[PDB]
Design a protein that fits this description.
- Chain B: One of its GO terms (cellular component) is euchromatin.
- Chain B: It is found in: Nucleus; Cytoplasm.
- Chain A has one helix and no strands.
- Chain B has a single domain, classed as Orthogonal Bundle (Retinoid X Receptor), CATH 1.10.565.10.
- Chain B is built from ten helices and three strands; from the N terminus they run αααβββααααααα.
- A three-stranded antiparallel beta sheet of chain B has the order 1-2-3.
- In chain B, strand 1 and strand 2 form a beta hairpin.
- The longest helix of chain B is centred in the last third of the chain and has 28 residues.
- Chain B is globular, with a radius of gyration of 18 Å.
- Classes of the chains: A mainly alpha, B mainly alpha.
- At the A-B interface, helix 1 of A face helix 2, helix 3 and helix 10 of B.
- The complex binds the ligand C=C1[C@H](O)CC(=C/C=C2\CCC[C@]3(C)[C@@H]([C@H](C)[C@@H](CCCC)CCC(C)(C)O)CC[C@@H]23)C[C@H]1O.
- The ligand C=C1[C@H](O)CC(=C/C=C2\CCC[C@]3(C)[C@@H]([C@H](C)[C@@H](CCCC)CCC(C)(C)O)CC[C@@H]23)C[C@H]1O binds next to helix 2, helix 3, helix 5, helix 8 and helix 10 of chain B.
Chain lengths: ~10, ~240
């Protein structure tokens, strides 16, 4: 929820 | 009596840590330079170091058996809440009792209480942080225990905003059982006595440090000038 960078790094 | 699965879990967590933790600290040269003169003068360097360390913790987490089976949202919730705690935990490897400081192989990359002060945090946070490091260092954990403690901290059911607490709990439980059995089977007295209960207590200490950090971070970050000194990942992960 509004965490594009974290989501990208996680997969 | 370590099951084959349990030995498997440990082998994966050791490799994952080796791949995400460089004991030479070579990448530290890519951070904005440390400055030990003004106020907030270590902030740019230390925010860089935090941002880097968030990436590395994310890369560790993804290797934790079962972690990938969680929902993306739950993975996000777990990383965001544990990130500072794992950075604290993982920092113990560079922390040295002699200097009461974190020693990353260079005078420029050696951090003491005053450097942390130059990051804009008060002694109210910094003092318990160093005490934490000292008590954790005294546990003298085997690297297997250390990597397990990190993984256990990340996969906590008791985190706000978690959707599937029950699945998170079952992932953790298997790590907790693995740790407990490792301490019993692979850890010799006297080092091993009440070692689990003490490791569990550090997880509680981390939560308190985490609370105090979020408070001082809101204060630091609340000013836009200071916020500008942070990185985009640090702002996303901690807040803004
Ligand atoms: C690679 C390593 C090495 O072991 C070196 C590491 C050292 C960690 C340190 C020492 C410097 C101060 C650090 C960065 C701390 C921050 C400045 C931290 C102080 C409050 C602690 C709760 C504030 C971070 C911000 C973003 C400014 O709020 C946390 C961990 C500390 C971390 C780890 O990733």
């Amino acid at each position: 929820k509004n965490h594009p960078m974290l989501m990208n790094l996680l997969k | 009596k370590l099951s084959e699965e349990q030995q498997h879990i440990i082998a994966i967590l050791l490799d994952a840590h080796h791949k995400t933790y460089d004991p030479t600290y070579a990448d530290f040269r890519d951070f904005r330079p440390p400055v030990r003169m003004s106020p907030l003068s270590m902030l740019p360097h230390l925010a860089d170091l935090v941002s880097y360390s968030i990436q590395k913790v994310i890369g560790f987490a993804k290797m934790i058996p079962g972690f990938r089976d969680l929902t993306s949202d739950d993975q996000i919730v777990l990383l965001k809440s544990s990130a500072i705690e794992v950075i604290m935990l993982r920092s113990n490897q560079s922390f040295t009792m002699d200097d009461m400081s974190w020693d990353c192989g260079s005078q420029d990359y050696k951090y003491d209480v005053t450097d942390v002060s130059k990051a804009g945090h008060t002694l109210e946070l910094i003092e318990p942080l160093i005490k934490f490091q000292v008590g954790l260092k005294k546990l003298n954990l085997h690297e297997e225990e250390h990597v397990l403690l990190m993984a256990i901290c990340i996969v906590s059911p008791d985190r706000p905003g978690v959707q599937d607490a029950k699945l998170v709990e079952a992932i953790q439980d298997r790590l907790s059982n693995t740790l407990q059995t490792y301490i019993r089977c692979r850890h010799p007295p006297p080092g091993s006595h009440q070692l689990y209960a003490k490791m569990i207590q550090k997880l509680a200490d981390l939560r308190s440090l985490n609370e105090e950090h979020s408070k001082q971070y809101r204060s630091l970050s609340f000013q836009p000038e200071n916020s500008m000194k942070l990185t985009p990942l640090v702002l996303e992960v901690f807040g803004n």
